[PDB]
Design a protein around this ligand. Structure first.
Ligand SMILES: [NH3+]Cc1ccc(F)c(Oc2ccccc2)c1F
Ligand SMILES: [NH3+]Cc1ccc(F)c(Oc2ccccc2)c1F
Lengths: 642, 645
């Protein structure tokens, strides 16, 4: 779908009023066609996608809005879809060349500290400028009131544009300040070159530099380029999220490039003294990050990946590498932030219909599409994997399920098979397939700052983003012909991750890598501050405050949550620690809380709830001082997008 | 818009019950099929996945009828092969509607044997074991978040033979966890199949020999409040007429003496008159303040405008329904032009014209041409007072006679007589009885809804929502009275009529406590009579919950309560009660919004975090949760709460 103009805010002192120009049906047809004949007028547009409505503001002949609303989408235009002229994911800023008829605001330069924010309800809200990109509301309002207003102008009294609104700063759901993209960032973006070529490895610089390498899988980002560097006499570390891919690089390299590299993973280490080392991000973190003078070049491969080990690994590199004597860090991915899935030569893409013997996510799979050959079917949950595999096996098709917890040996690796897998496949198994069939959805975790009493981690099923779609499809068509079948043609924008992932980073720092919350913060700050990487709201101080209060955890409970391998071993174990010590029961008797089972007869009373990691069946008390501490942590400034 | 079928849930034909789904329409397809109401896709399976523009849920064909829930479908038609299919059954009280299924469509059939082992089919195609625990209730073997059940209303509960026990309508929840489920029994459906499709309630009922409650559905202007009590009086009966509005009540009284030659008793705050006549006109509030039905005083009680879901009306009607028989009445008449399930249809005196973007006057994203409102007497409905003020300000600026009216202002600021554009909120309909050359409708309304948010307790949220069919009809009814009228609108709206939020129940306990000296127990008896009486607006049954809350709210400060009563804002009891706990802890109110004005004089001595009882608006101050009343209300949140799915 395209972004589509559905109304405008007419500006006049400053006053405004709105016009709606399209209803639902109009919006939807126009999004699918990309063809908008409606005459555009004014400098502020009300825009919508399928899921969301926000604002857009024309300045210097460019219609600007936020990446978090528009992603990389085209804008429906008089002659068809308009592709973005500017995309700056770090600044949360995108722009399309303004269509004919649209007026621009003029940048504000004299620079008043009295500002006026124009919202989607056509209210004009006074704001006191506090920085380059920040202003305080004279009257604090519920954030709910500012939602849908992303992309709207902050104006000085003369009606010139200071910037566009991107986020609210909140104390317990009440917005006290606003963050905006300043016009100077728009000017810097306009002056940058549209096409910057990152497809080729950079030469080693004289002094330290961080570079980006955007190149497809099979381009030898992880083999040919490290070989070339070693041949120039450098020492090179290559980090990858997958154990299977890390181990695989070693056999390929001693064969294809005459180097027997060091290999470091949790399951297996090999030290040959060679000048190339392959390691997982997790093992790299276990080994204590950069060792002084060990490496000249560090390649962080699959740097689009937003699991917490990778982010924490990369932040460690970015924080430590210069000081450890490295001259070059290379951030490598085939799918950088803001990338979109485009046709691939090796891969025929065919929509699933309703005809076929096998139900699948509301559509169907013909038995003939998978009867012989080697096929991969991506499902969102292990439950779906188990059931679809059982169904296929019942029909005599050789089928197997793979997901977190199973050994990859369930394979086969040779011969006819249908593999039914979650995304755990990506990191567990490196092979390719004749076809990939994709449900186009993913399970994710999102934090809800629900104040009941503290926060909640919610597990939801969502539409896949463009990284997911590209990585799942990329399991077919590798140096041979392939087919990608799909349920849905969409893809969410890439390059963004939820605050829950930050929480997971602190959790893993504490649970696995012996990192203080303060140390985790230094490493994440380096990640956040480095451009060209996936982006997130800055909740570092908040999450640091939370974990900082979680002292004297019970080692035994932690070992058991770590061992059982579920998602926030430290939060889980810590809640179990305070339950045991308070001599009180867990929030429920779900599997999550099994580490308390032997104390179940001597439990009793309401649970001293710290936070919500699932359904809470038992009664709760809010009297525990850790609860009160975490409650106090909720008063921190929290960036929230509008 | 019609409801449209967008998929289906296919059940296993033998062995264990299992299921899977098939999606038959995307978004665009759904939206288009909604507009035309024309759906050529044939209807396989017995469980359909249905959608409106706003939501999706299920519908289960049993015995040639495609059944679903009123809270999902309202009174809407179902997109069909020859165009929209009108509902054949609409039972608001059971939350059950039915459309005749297209010929050839597959249909489940009823549970002949009678198992206590049940299986609920969800929109996800899961089959969830349920233990039957009554005629319309069953326990979940494995408790689940209620979020997992949403979108599943209208789906079947099956017995082991795959035969239908009933359709899912609501979950019973403890702090967001569903432990049980409510369904419409297949027996409630088989009645409706066998019974008459049409009812006529257009004539006033004959006085029966023994107590009965009857409905009168007839237009404004058929004399529901004048002609019919007069006709009853003419047959020797004593009649009490209840109405929500003082102005309407006084207006009827006066008309009766001038037209039908009776000088009736009149009972209102501003004017009370006893003549000994056999007709009496009262507001519901005065009737409540009088202490309800007095023994032997009336044969007939007309509860007029019985579609109203303000708390005074609900509590008033509930009192009549609980007391009237024992007080000797023979007949209660529940009277409205717009009963639950009603829909706006064309009116002959009224030309209805959509606003466009053409016009000098911005109006809710559209525009009003000046020429439409310069010549004559005109009524513009706005959702809020701010907007009424900003629009009047603009209109006078452009040289028009424009006045604003909303709660807090005095009527008669409206010329009589003169020649005018009045810009008003819904308060107009109870403050002023006149009609107009045209009505201009924003088609939206301010409403309050309760969120059981556990942060720490509940929240009453003020929102702006699309209007319902009662609102549309009532706003449109202010033109085309006896003559030609013009109705201009922003949207062709109508959410479904006859449902009210749990916050209104809260308001009834609040009003019992604040105005009418009703203990929560006593309020519950009256409310129970209203909910148990069919054909009235309906709500989820949270009576025990709300009773429990108010029962603990004792020793309020009488001074603060008298100030919130007088100021006329919503929830005077809960506002005064929060202020009471603040003042006694020397703590500030949650904010310094006007809601908290009773505490302004004390601001210099108020310090620290507010002991927060509940959320009635934005909370700006820091909060503490240690107050014993906070804890008591927290404990009330463990109650079983009906929540629609
Ligand atoms: N300030 C950094 C930043 C940059 C770009 C974004 F789109 C963005 O917005 C989101 C929103 C939700 C999740 C992740 C990122 C953001 F915060
Ligand atoms: N059990 C009584 C009842 C009857 C009909 C309904 F539509 C209904 O559903 C709602 C839903 C939201 C608000 C009010 C009523 C309901 F509860």
């Amino acid at each position: 779908g395209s972004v589509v103009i559905v109304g405008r805010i007419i500006l006049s002192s400053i006053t405004a009023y709105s016009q709606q120009t399209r209803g639902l049906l109009g919006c939807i047809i126009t999004s699918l066609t990309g063809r908008d004949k409606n005459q555009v007028e004014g400098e502020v547009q009300v825009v919508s996608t399928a899921t969301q409505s926000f604002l857009a503001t024309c300045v210097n002949g460019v219609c600007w809005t936020v990446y978090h609303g528009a992603g990389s989408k085209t804008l429906a235009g008089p002659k068809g879809p308009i592709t973005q002229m500017y995309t700056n994911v770090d600044q949360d800023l995108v722009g399309w060349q303004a269509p004919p008829g649209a007026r621009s605001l003029t940048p504000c330069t004299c620079g008043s500290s009295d500002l006026y924010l124009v919202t989607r309800h056509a209210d004009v809200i006074p704001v006191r400028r506090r920085g380059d990109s920040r202003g305080s509301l004279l009257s604090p309002r519920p954030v709910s009131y500012l939602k849908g207003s992303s992309g709207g102008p902050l104006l000085c009294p003369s009606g010139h544009a200071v910037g566009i609104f991107r986020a609210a700063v909140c104390t317990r759901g009440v917005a006290k300040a606003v963050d905006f993209v300043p016009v100077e960032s728009m000017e810097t973006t306009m002056r940058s070159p549209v096409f910057t070529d990152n497809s080729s490895p950079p030469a080693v610089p004289q002094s330290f530099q961080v570079a980006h390498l955007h190149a497809p899988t099979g381009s030898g980002k992880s083999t040919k380029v490290p070989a070339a560097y070693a041949a120039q006499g450098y020492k090179v570390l290559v980090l990858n999220p997958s154990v299977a891919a890390t181990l695989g690089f070693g056999a390929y390299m001693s064969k294809a490039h005459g180097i027997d590299p060091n290999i470091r993973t949790g399951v297996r280490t090999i030290t040959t003294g060679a000048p190339v080392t392959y390691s997982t991000y997790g093992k790299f973190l276990a080994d204590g990050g950069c060792s002084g003078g060990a490496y000249d070049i560090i390649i962080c491969d699959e740097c689009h990946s937003t699991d917490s080990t990778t982010i924490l690994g990369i932040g460690t590199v970015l924080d430590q590498a210069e000081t450890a004597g490295a001259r070059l860090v290379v951030l490598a991915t085939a799918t950088p932030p803001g990338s979109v899935t485009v046709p691939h030569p090796n891969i025929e893409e065919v929509a699933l219909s309703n005809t076929g013997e096998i139900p699948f996510y509301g559509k169907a799979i013909p038995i003939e599409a998978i009867r012989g050959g080697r096929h991969l079917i991506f499902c969102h949950s292990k439950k779906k994997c188990d059931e679809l595999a059982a169904k296929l096996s019942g029909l005599g098709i050789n089928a197997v399920a793979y997901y977190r917890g199973l050994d990859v040996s369930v394979i086969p690796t040779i011969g006819d098979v249908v593999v039914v897998a979650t995304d755990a496949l990506m990191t567990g198994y490196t092979g390719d397939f004749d076809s990939v069939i994709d449900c186009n959805t993913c399970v994710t975790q999102t934090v809800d700052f629900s104040l009941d009493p503290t926060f909640t981690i919610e597990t939801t099923t969502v539409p896949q983003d463009a990284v997911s779609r590209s990585q799942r499809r990329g399991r077919t068509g590798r140096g041979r012909r392939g087919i990608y079948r799909f349920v849905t043609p969409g893809e969410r924008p890439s390059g963004m991750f939820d605050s829950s992932v930050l929480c997971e980073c602190y959790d893993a720092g504490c649970a696995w890598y012996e990192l203080t919350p303060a140390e985790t913060s230094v490493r994440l700050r380096a990640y956040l501050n480095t451009p060209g990487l996936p982006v997130c709201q800055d909740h570092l101080e908040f999450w640091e405050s939370v974990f900082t209060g979680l002292t004297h955890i019970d080692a035994h409970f932690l070992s058991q949550t770590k061992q059982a391998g579920d998602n926030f071993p430290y939060l889980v174990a810590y809640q179990a620690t305070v339950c045991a010590r308070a001599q009180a029961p867990p929030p429920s008797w779900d599997q999550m809380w099994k580490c308390l089972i032997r104390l179940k007869p001597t439990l009793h009373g309401p649970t001293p709830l710290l936070y919500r990691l699932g359904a809470v069946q038992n009664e709760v008390t809010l009297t525990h001082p850790i609860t009160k501490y975490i409650m106090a942590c909720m008063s921190a400034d929290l960036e929230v997008v509008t």
